[PDB]
Design an enzyme around this catalytic site. Structure first.
Site, PDB file in Angstrom:
ATOM      1  N   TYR A   1       2.502  -4.905  11.995  1.00 12.04           N
ATOM      2  CA  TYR A   1       2.294  -3.450  11.947  1.00 12.04           C
ATOM      3  C   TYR A   1       2.972  -2.745  13.108  1.00 12.04           C
ATOM      4  CZ  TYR A   1      -1.565  -4.312   8.555  1.00 12.04           C
ATOM      5  OH  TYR A   1      -2.362  -4.747   7.495  1.00 12.04           O
TER       6      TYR A   1
ATOM      7  N   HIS B   1       0.810  -1.213   0.000  1.00 12.74           N
ATOM      8  CA  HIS B   1       0.000   0.000   0.000  1.00 12.74           C
ATOM      9  C   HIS B   1       0.829   1.242   0.000  1.00 12.74           C
ATOM     10  CE1 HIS B   1      -3.809  -2.327   0.892  1.00 12.74           C
ATOM     11  NE2 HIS B   1      -2.926  -3.165   1.471  1.00 12.74           N
TER      12      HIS B   1
ATOM     13  N   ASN C   1      -9.779  -3.191   3.455  1.00  9.14           N
ATOM     14  CA  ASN C   1      -9.597  -3.147   1.995  1.00  9.14           C
ATOM     15  C   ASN C   1     -10.954  -2.874   1.341  1.00  9.14           C
ATOM     16  OD1 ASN C   1      -6.772  -3.555   1.633  1.00  9.14           O
ATOM     17  ND2 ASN C   1      -6.991  -5.807   1.496  1.00  9.14           N
TER      18      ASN C   1
HETATM   19  C1  HDD Z   1       1.538 -10.279   8.213  1.00  9.60           C
HETATM   20  C2  HDD Z   1       1.701  -9.359   7.282  1.00  9.60           C
HETATM   21  C3  HDD Z   1       0.467  -8.735   6.782  1.00  9.60           C
HETATM   22  C4  HDD Z   1      -0.789  -9.373   6.417  1.00  9.60           C
HETATM   23  C5  HDD Z   1      -1.248 -10.808   6.469  1.00  9.60           C
HETATM   24  C6  HDD Z   1      -1.569  -8.213   6.011  1.00  9.60           C
HETATM   25  N1  HDD Z   1      -0.918  -7.026   6.049  1.00  9.60           N
HETATM   26 FE1  HDD Z   1      -1.653  -5.124   5.699  1.00  9.60          FE
HETATM   27  N2  HDD Z   1       0.153  -4.354   6.010  1.00  9.60           N
HETATM   28  C7  HDD Z   1       1.254  -4.997   6.510  1.00  9.60           C
HETATM   29  C8  HDD Z   1       1.359  -6.326   6.731  1.00  9.60           C
HETATM   30  C9  HDD Z   1       0.299  -7.308   6.538  1.00  9.60           C
HETATM   31  C10 HDD Z   1       2.457  -4.108   6.871  1.00  9.60           C
HETATM   32  C11 HDD Z   1       3.798  -4.543   6.258  1.00  9.60           C
HETATM   33  O1  HDD Z   1       2.692  -4.115   8.300  1.00  9.60           O
HETATM   34  C12 HDD Z   1       1.942  -2.735   6.435  1.00  9.60           C
HETATM   35  C13 HDD Z   1       2.845  -1.894   5.529  1.00  9.60           C
HETATM   36  C14 HDD Z   1       2.877  -0.454   6.071  1.00  9.60           C
HETATM   37  C15 HDD Z   1       2.195  -0.554   7.389  1.00  9.60           C
HETATM   38  O2  HDD Z   1       2.011   0.351   8.210  1.00  9.60           O
HETATM   39  O3  HDD Z   1       1.764  -1.897   7.603  1.00  9.60           O
HETATM   40  C16 HDD Z   1       0.547  -3.050   5.851  1.00  9.60           C
HETATM   41  C17 HDD Z   1      -0.182  -2.077   5.265  1.00  9.60           C
HETATM   42  C18 HDD Z   1      -1.625  -2.119   5.005  1.00  9.60           C
HETATM   43  C19 HDD Z   1      -2.441  -0.950   4.596  1.00  9.60           C
HETATM   44  C20 HDD Z   1      -1.994   0.471   4.400  1.00  9.60           C
HETATM   45  C21 HDD Z   1      -2.373   1.319   5.628  1.00  9.60           C
HETATM   46  C22 HDD Z   1      -2.032   2.747   5.280  1.00  9.60           C
HETATM   47  O4  HDD Z   1      -2.777   3.344   4.474  1.00  9.60           O
HETATM   48  O5  HDD Z   1      -1.007   3.269   5.757  1.00  9.60           O
HETATM   49  C23 HDD Z   1      -3.786  -1.500   4.462  1.00  9.60           C
HETATM   50  C24 HDD Z   1      -5.089  -0.822   4.080  1.00  9.60           C
HETATM   51  C25 HDD Z   1      -3.580  -2.918   4.783  1.00  9.60           C
HETATM   52  N3  HDD Z   1      -2.313  -3.268   5.058  1.00  9.60           N
HETATM   53  C26 HDD Z   1      -4.710  -3.843   4.847  1.00  9.60           C
HETATM   54  C27 HDD Z   1      -4.672  -5.282   5.047  1.00  9.60           C
HETATM   55  C28 HDD Z   1      -5.900  -6.110   4.980  1.00  9.60           C
HETATM   56  C29 HDD Z   1      -7.323  -5.685   4.690  1.00  9.60           C
HETATM   57  C30 HDD Z   1      -5.323  -7.445   5.184  1.00  9.60           C
HETATM   58  C31 HDD Z   1      -5.997  -8.768   5.217  1.00  9.60           C
HETATM   59  C32 HDD Z   1      -7.125  -8.860   5.910  1.00  9.60           C
HETATM   60  C33 HDD Z   1      -3.878  -7.246   5.378  1.00  9.60           C
HETATM   61  N4  HDD Z   1      -3.526  -5.941   5.322  1.00  9.60           N
HETATM   62  C34 HDD Z   1      -2.973  -8.369   5.663  1.00  9.60           C
END
Ligand code: HDD
Ligand code: HDD
Ligand SMILES: [Ca+2]
Ligand SMILES: [Ca+2]
Ligand SMILES: [Ca+2]
Ligand SMILES: [Ca+2]
Ligand SMILES: [Ca+2]
Ligand SMILES: [Ca+2]
Lengths: 673, 671, 355
Positions: A348, A61, A134
């Site tokens: 996160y 994202h 999402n």
């Molecule tokens: C275990 C790892 C992992 C898994 C399974 C997911 N994500 Fe995630 N997501 C992350 C690891 C992550 C992250 C690497 O931790 C991020 C990248 C930047 C942040 O702050 O968190 C992230 C970012 C992130 C953002 C951007 C937030 C923003 O605007 O700053 C959204 C909307 C989502 N995710 C949504 C989801 C949804 C709806 C998931 C399934 C239900 C999901 N993620 C599963």
């Protein structure tokens, strides 16, 4: 709202960061044509700052945009949750939301085909609460440990970093075909939900089952659904591709403009609520994030209104730096044992160390809560606080036992739902209740209209035709065939392979409400929709016609662009910069018929805008009475649905506005027999 | 090579942690089969922690780019002009790595944005790494490095909403250009076809600044670097570049990757203009001023050697993303000048690697390592990968016998500052008056373009400035443009419905210079790698027959052939649905396909015809082999329009069209 | 040394964790904290942290990435890299596996097990197992520290806890701080002992190699340096580290009195040729005698070699018949006796006990 942290530079002399007045336009040199001096601190502080402006982009994202707003509760929800922000009719809480794509880097296009983020922070009076959702209600995978596999497969191939912001390559489809859990989200992403018309025309979903927890300890299972008050709408793929080039900023610009014009978007924040006893009652496991609860089994309950109505002051400080976490939870909400959610909780908190470069990221203005903080966290790089308490340990007598422990019975503490238990072996095993990867993708497909089903088939034909490995293409057909034999045959036809024999194990004819975009009926509002009026400077009467149309269209809250060969009063855009992707409907004033060669725009440009708008399904027409020259040149039938011809400006606008609400005239797209 | 030693093979074996313990990574450890995940799951946390930390800050500028490995070969022993070891023998080979880029866009932005492009070259010499960090345009926007954040903030997205991406087409950029007239020369270059090159292989590289070549005897001469493409110069047209940005954001990096994989690695002659120190102000401008070129009529090019790129990277992050260039990477035989833009760059590139790498040992990354031993007293720091055996790392010492020894002009082949260099005068923050003519060279450049090339530049300015909201900024823009050329100010003003200010002839002149025009540079010297789209149909065995015969005749000439039809099969490469004219340098319709040009669920309405029409409109060679020209409204007697029943006759004519590359008669000119 | 980054999460097949809640949380901390130290995620690539076997996984990128990975399909499951790397587990590839008999049952709780509740019986078991002088040293360490605590309430609270382990400990500590110990609370008192926890009672050292012997000598007397040289030869034969000390350095003298201290030695011998030393611009007043006196007071073996001991021993107020005090003319005999004292290590009879 973050007013306390704003810095104004509308007056004053330049200073260093330590308030010494300086200049910053010429280096200090040994002589007028001499070398620059190491003692030039003005130079070095300014360039060191510039050299260090960038921070790592989010791991996923990375491309997104945010705005501030307000949530208002519709009721006292005490009877189902202890959550303070939900505890009284009309109670208001500030929010910040960021929307995004998933795969592309910073600077990639808004209109890539992708799953979209919808992350909402509620700055509540008992702590920040984030719902990191999402625009699609199901996820690709069933266990968080698989996230790097999914993301490596959909991001660019790591030898050459190609392709940007796209699942149209071998590795992505290899993963999808080897990991059949991906089918449900894949069908959503291949539908119009992968290319929404704007952030304001999509919904938000928490995806996981969570818990609502009452003050008495009882809990219920919930799903979050943020339902758009603007309606649902998509682009067509061929339009999305051109828009990606003409305006990579299309979604962020749409949101920014809607807010500036006093048209801030709204959603009803809703939940499906079910009992703990219904976790396996609907023919699937509520812990499985690849499944929806059909609305026929559990209706939506409207909790309150989310409205976005203020744009940021500094994008980097606010939007780039906002650090969401599903661990930002408040009393009255709890987690479930969904193995995808479970692992997110770790990710996160960890990943903000990478972004921020140090542990005090909760101190950045956009991340701060709006209540006091009392804890024994100390030190760390970038520590902004000066803590008075010189005994930051528990238990203590030297600070009289403060801060006090908060829990279910004292201090409004968070508490884990007390009815939750675990049993059995410590295992790295998948529950067999998760094994049906295909029935719900079929449910989704069945619920789309015929042209919607064609669009989804065509997205797959497009992407899969770009996969070079013939073994991957065959494996893809194997999986699609388990969802639908017809999908598999139709996709196969474009790639010149044969589909495998029907396998009916998961086939069925059930449908569910609320997932179709085409079937969701006309938009409930046309405010903010864009109308391009194609005119000419050759005829002062064409400009007059355009001016009249503008007045009548603007009165109804449409955004009107008059296009001509050159700028002047009343003309917003030249033909050289205009494109059909810039409009939701296109009107030609009949005084401009002649344009339908110049050094002022590319050959055929005025006609191409009209033809593109028609072929992409938009309402189009000619205002003035003389329409055949334009319609014939464009090969558009005068009797077509969504094609308007009237002499009367008032009558033209009345009919045209019905067309803007229909939004897309799907009868212009060919269907497989 | 430091790179081979660090390659890791994963084509066999069982999954392990980073410390070699065999593990699994597909299911989390849970308390019960439907239970919560355990903290003790080290397999989960090591994998997710890595993923969570995969990203590093993008480069502050030139974030979007792509690299390749190759070789530089010297043509001669150049000892007579420089002590540089890599230039000291005929045939001497030195490994290189080059990264090409745009400037303003973030790392996921489109290759075909209009912009200045980077061309950064590292020579891993036997006397240390030497970098020439250049651009595809020989002059820069500003005259002092302290102004770089001003320029860059102004061209990057507006900081309240971060709009627009990878574009100068907004108020702040034109406000800066109009207030800071030094920008005019580079602005003119960027508004020409040099802003939208056809590929990294069809552009030149320039060091921009005057540097010194220094001989072992201490004498020095002033030089400009010019890397001259052996592929020829070629540009896109703007409407094409915009579509391409959407249809294939990766166009240039793909073009480079493919050219290397096919055995067509791109080549440049590495050249210099060489003049005496006494000529610093002899040419009517100051050689310390990075907004000025030396016209080739005053100083010819000397060809020093051949640069060839012929190997793609193994891991893009490890090699391309992590390469850290510095003009401070200099070797004996080369020196700096007092160009105030160059002077400040020396500081910025050493500092900014701390941001990217997160620690001070960035020179130890395999892509940044030298190909000779390192002997110094630098120690410790985060990510220290060496174990130093010298326990007395200070100078002067006796306890390590005085090693490492000092290197200088007379010991150890040390770098030395050109010993004829001096400074004199007050310590000042003043601009030299010799830098004040901001308009004559922009005029020289414009004068040297062909009439349709001048029209393209005018149209680029008309496009961008029409998107500036501020009437005040637009008027200020015309004021500056008018100082270069009244005619340009008039023609641009016509598009924005403002009046141009009266002629101001202070800097007007009629002089021209060789080597700066793309259109005027003649037919391409090679057509190898150029792309031909053959538009065919599956509904005719004749159509696929004609396509296959063409393919044989075009392929043996080195062209990349894509047969396009409704659906894939044997001999068909691409469906209509995924095809676009931006994907080809020439388009050929087989006449067996004529019905497609007259609806299908398999591609958008009118796609086959649109490909042909777009290709024509954008100036490409187009032809029908065997009503198609009628349907397309394409004149059968047009230059670069081909119509033959003979396969060999068609191909011979068509391939001449490919060399010509663009048929500029198809574009309207101002009267 | 500075960059080595240990983790209890560095575990191998054949070993597993338990549900000790202190251990459980350590597993998190040590992976996270290396990000702080190293400033980036590739800390396992530092030479000291690398394994001695091949690494096969799909971890990628990150600041400081030193590898160039050839596999361009780093995801599982894949076909484009033929399913490699392969998953390792109990039955294939010698994978780590959690002990399969382990289970969990019950509520999800932030509660302490009541099985953890006895905080005092084992401290008393430990205290009971120390020798009398060892118990005194422990009491003396608490008297030292608690006397520096300014809060009278904290000091009172400390005695309440100590008293639950041992009333006698609380009484003896209380005495130094002018507070009264609370009344005996015998809930957790007992007389049980355990082997192997006492230092004082663990017997003579099994080796004296590396132990340090300071020989205090003088440059005034040629005979004193000759004695020091003969003693050095005989003691170095047995692997002891010998330091000869005199007013100034010269061949055979290692250290000046100015830099010497008793803390530098495990045993101290004065050569009788140096008896007169026991004022100069060359060392602080009284330094030679102070080294001997300190060594004696701290329990170390001390002696005079050469035959004439009474002048030195009397000046030091050290009894000639004391245990761990040596006097012989014969170098050979002196060394034999002194080496027994080095193995004994500490002469604990020199320390006063509470009555
Ligand atoms: C275990 C790892 C992992 C898994 C399974 C997911 N994500 Fe995630 N997501 C992350 C690891 C992550 C992250 C690497 O931790 C991020 C990248 C930047 C942040 O702050 O968190 C992230 C970012 C992130 C953002 C951007 C937030 C923003 O605007 O700053 C959204 C909307 C989502 N995710 C949504 C989801 C949804 C709806 C998931 C399934 C239900 C999901 N993620 C599963
Ligand atoms: C004082 C600041 C400053 C100024 C005046 C310039 N630059 Fe620069 N440049 C940087 C500060 C900088 C930087 C912030 O230090 C970058 C970002 C990433 C890096 O390694 O250095 C950089 C990156 C960078 C790159 C990317 C190298 C790569 O591919 O990794 C190129 C090609 C150039 N620059 C070229 C130029 C040219 C031809 C200049 C004018 C003659 C110029 N820069 C002026
Ligand atoms: Ca791929
Ligand atoms: Ca749709
Ligand atoms: Ca709890
Ligand atoms: Ca702007
Ligand atoms: Ca051009
Ligand atoms: Ca750091």
């Amino acid at each position: 709202p973050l007013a306390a942290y704003e810095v104004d530079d509308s007056t004053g002399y330049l200073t260093s960061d330590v308030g010494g007045p300086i200049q910053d336009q010429t280096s200090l040199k040994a002589g007028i044509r001499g070398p620059t001096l190491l003692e030039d601190f003005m130079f070095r502080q300014k360039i060191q700052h510039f050299d260090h402006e960038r921070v790592p982009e989010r791991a996923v994202h990375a491309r997104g945009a945010g705005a501030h707003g307000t949530f208002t509760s519709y009721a006292d929800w005490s009877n189902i949750t202890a959550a303070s922000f939900l505890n009284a009719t009309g109670k208001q809480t500030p929010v910040f939301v960021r929307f995004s794509t998933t795969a592309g880097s910073r600077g990639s296009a808004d209109t890539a085909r992708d799953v979209h983020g919808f992350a909402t922070r509620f700055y509540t009076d008992e702590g920040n609460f984030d719902i990191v959702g999402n625009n699609i209600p199901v996820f690709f995978i069933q266990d968080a440990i698989q996230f790097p596999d999914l993301i490596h497969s959909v991001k660019p191939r790591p030898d050459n970093e190609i392709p940007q912001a796209a699942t149209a390559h071998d590795s992505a489809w290899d993963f999808f075909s080897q990991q059949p859990s991906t089918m449900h989200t894949l069908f959503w992403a291949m539908s119009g939900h992968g290319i929404p018309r704007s952030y304001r025309h999509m919904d938000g979903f928490g995806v996981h089952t969570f818990r609502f927890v009452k003050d008495d300890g009882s809990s219920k299972l919930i799903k979050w659904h943020f339902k758009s008050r603007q309606g649902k709408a998509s682009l067509v793929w061929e339009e999305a591709q051109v828009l990606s080039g003409k305006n990579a900023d299309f979604h962020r610009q749409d949101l920014w403009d809607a807010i500036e014009s006093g048209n801030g978007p709204e959603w009803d924040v809703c939940v499906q609520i079910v009992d703990e006893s219904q976790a396996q009652a609907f023919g699937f496991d509520l812990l499985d994030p690849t499944k929806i609860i059909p609305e026929e089994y559990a209706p939506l309950t409207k909790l309150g209104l989310l409205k976005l109505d203020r744009n940021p002051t500094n994008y980097f400080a606010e939007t780039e730096q906002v650090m969401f976490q599903p661990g930002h939870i408040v009393r009255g909400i709890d987690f479930t044992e969904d193995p995808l959610l479970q692992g997110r909780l770790f990710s996160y908190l960890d990943t903000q160390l990478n972004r921020n470069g140090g542990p005090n990221f909760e101190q950045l203005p956009i991340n701060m809560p709006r209540v006091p903080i009392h804890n024994n966290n100390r030190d760390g790089a970038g520590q902004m606080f000066i803590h008075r308490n010189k005994y930051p340990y528990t238990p203590n007598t030297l600070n009289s036992g403060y801060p006090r422990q908060a829990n279910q019975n004292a201090g409004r503490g968070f508490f884990t739902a007390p009815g939750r238990t675990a049993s059995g072996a410590l295992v790295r095993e998948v529950s067999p209740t998760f094994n049906d990867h295909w029935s719900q993708p079929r449910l989704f497909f069945n619920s789309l209209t015929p042209v919607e089903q064609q669009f989804l088939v065509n997205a797959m034909r497009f992407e899969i035709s770009l996969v070079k490995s013939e073994e991957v293409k065959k494996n893809v057909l194997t999986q699609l065939n388990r969802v639908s034999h017809d999908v598999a045959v139709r996709v196969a036809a474009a790639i010149g392979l044969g589909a495998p024999d029907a396998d009916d194990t998961y086939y069925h004819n059930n449908k569910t409400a609320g997932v179709s975009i085409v079937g969701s009926g006309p938009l409930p509002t046309i405010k903010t929709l864009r109308v391009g009026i194609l005119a000419t400077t050759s005829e002062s009467s064409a400009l007059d016609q355009a001016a009249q149309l503008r007045t009548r269209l603007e009165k109804d809250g449409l955004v009107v662009t008059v296009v001509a060969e050159t700028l002047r009063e009343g003309v917003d855009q030249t033909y050289s910069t205009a494109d059909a992707t810039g409009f939701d409907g296109v009107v030609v004033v009949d005084g401009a018929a002649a344009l339908f060669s110049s050094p002022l725009f590319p050959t055929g440009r005025p006609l191409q805008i009209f033809v593109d708008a028609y072929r992409w399904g938009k309402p189009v027409g000619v205002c003035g009475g003389k329409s055949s020259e334009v319609l014939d040149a464009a090969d558009v039938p005068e009797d077509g649905d969504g094609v308007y011809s009237e002499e009367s400006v008032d009558m033209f606008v009345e009919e045209f506005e019905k067309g803007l609400a229909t939004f897309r005239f799907t009868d212009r797209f060919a269907l497989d027999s």
